[PDB]
Nucleic acid binder design. Structure first.
Ligand SMILES: [Zn+2]
Length: 127
DNA sequence: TGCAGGCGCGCCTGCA
DNA sequence: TGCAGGCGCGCCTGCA
């Protein structure tokens, strides 16, 4: 997919042949989800292209669990995309704190969850 | 063209 | 309660 190629140019880090193919499938699962909503893909690309410039929420439906499954692998969606485009070494959701600018941060128990990586800041995980 | 096979969501179990 | 992983219906789409 050509959209997956433009977003994968923003991917951080150096992953192996298996993990590069997994992030490609994770980005594809997200593109397939944001294509139904008008302006969602454009907002994500803008947020990724201009890091230090304000961006709107880019959300997907919240599962009861909080997990998103991509190629039989389970994980929280906002952690997945924050790892792809910002912090490859992100250990867990405990290392993310939402910005006041985000309406749908993870943990807000709303119908939608924001996956815009620049709507979270990286923090040290507590004891 | 269409439906079969692939695989995610949502249920569960098991520690902790 | 949180979190990891098994399982199978049901939605989807790729290739027969
Ligand atoms: Zn947001």
């Amino acid at each position: 997919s050509p959209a997956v190629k433009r977003l994968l140019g923003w991917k951080q880090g150096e992953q192996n042949g298996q993990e590069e193919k997994w992030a490609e499938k994770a980005v594809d699962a997200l593109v397939k989800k944001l294509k139904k909503k008008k302006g969602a893909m454009e907002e994500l690309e803008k947020a990724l292209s201009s890091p230090g410039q304000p961006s709107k929420c880019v959300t997907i439906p919240r599962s009861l669990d909080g997990r998103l499954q991509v190629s039989h692998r389970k994980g929280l969606p906002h952690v997945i995309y924050c790892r792809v485009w910002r912090w490859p070494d992100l250990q867990s959701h405990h290392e993310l704190k939402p910005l006041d600018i985000c309406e749908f941060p993870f943990g807000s128990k709303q119908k939608e969850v924001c996956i815009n990586p620049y709507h979270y800041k990286r923090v040290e995980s507590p004891v």
